[PDB]
Amino acid sequence: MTVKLDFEECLKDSPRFRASIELVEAEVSELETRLEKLLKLGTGLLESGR
């Protein structure tokens, strides 16, 4: 995702902002899958250890 963003392009309706907000929503959609896989995989670990 973008690293440390500020307001000018954002308010001037820049295409750079617009592709940058597109690309972070997809990183967060990836992130959530990786979380629910880690949740179910660590649940099976805890069950396997118990």
Binding site: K4, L5, D6, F7, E8, E9, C10, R16, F17, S20
Partner: protein
């Protein structure tokens, strides 16, 4: 007094040219000529100045 490059509020932090003055133990920068200046450091004597070898 003189021109320096500084980082702006563009998202990448885009670098940009402004006219700066050191006066009365203070660093200001000019917004447009004759309109009032903006402060950069309140007092330079509580400042450090880093040559910054990792940028």
């Amino acid at each position: 007094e003189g021109h320096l490059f500084k980082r702006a509020s563009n998202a990448f932090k885009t670098w940009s040219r402004r006219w700066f003055t050191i006066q009365s133990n203070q660093l200001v920068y000019q917004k447009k000529y004759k309109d009032p200046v903006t402060v950069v450091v309140d007092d330079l004597r509580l400042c450090t100045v880093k040559l910054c070898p990792d940028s």
